Amino acid sequence: MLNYNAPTDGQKSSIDGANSDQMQTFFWLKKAIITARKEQYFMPLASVTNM
């Protein structure tokens, strides 16, 4: 039986030999996870005197 097996775990598919592997073992979700800028509470409290 030709089995997909589990290439990501080192279990090659039946179709792949010693010198072959799956070209695409995963799908890339191109939208990355990012964190927002930390809030500021004291900067708005500061008055400005020109130097």
Binding site: M1, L2, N3, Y4, S13, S14, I15, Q22, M23, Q24, T25
Partner: protein
């Protein structure tokens, strides 16, 4: 020494026979196969594998 010489009186001389041969041949059965799962097709990188 084996020519079919015939004398003036004929007779039972120079009789011959014939032969035939039979040839024959037969046929034979062949075949092979392979198996596969659905995952081996759907999750494989190459869509032209089959």
């Amino acid at each position: 020494s084996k020519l079919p010489l015939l004398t003036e009186n004929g007779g039972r001389v120079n009789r011959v026979g014939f032969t035939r041969i039979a040839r024959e041949g037969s046929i034979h059965k062949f075949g092979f196969f392979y198996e596969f799962t659905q995952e081996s097709i759907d999750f494989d990188s190459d869509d032209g594998l089959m």
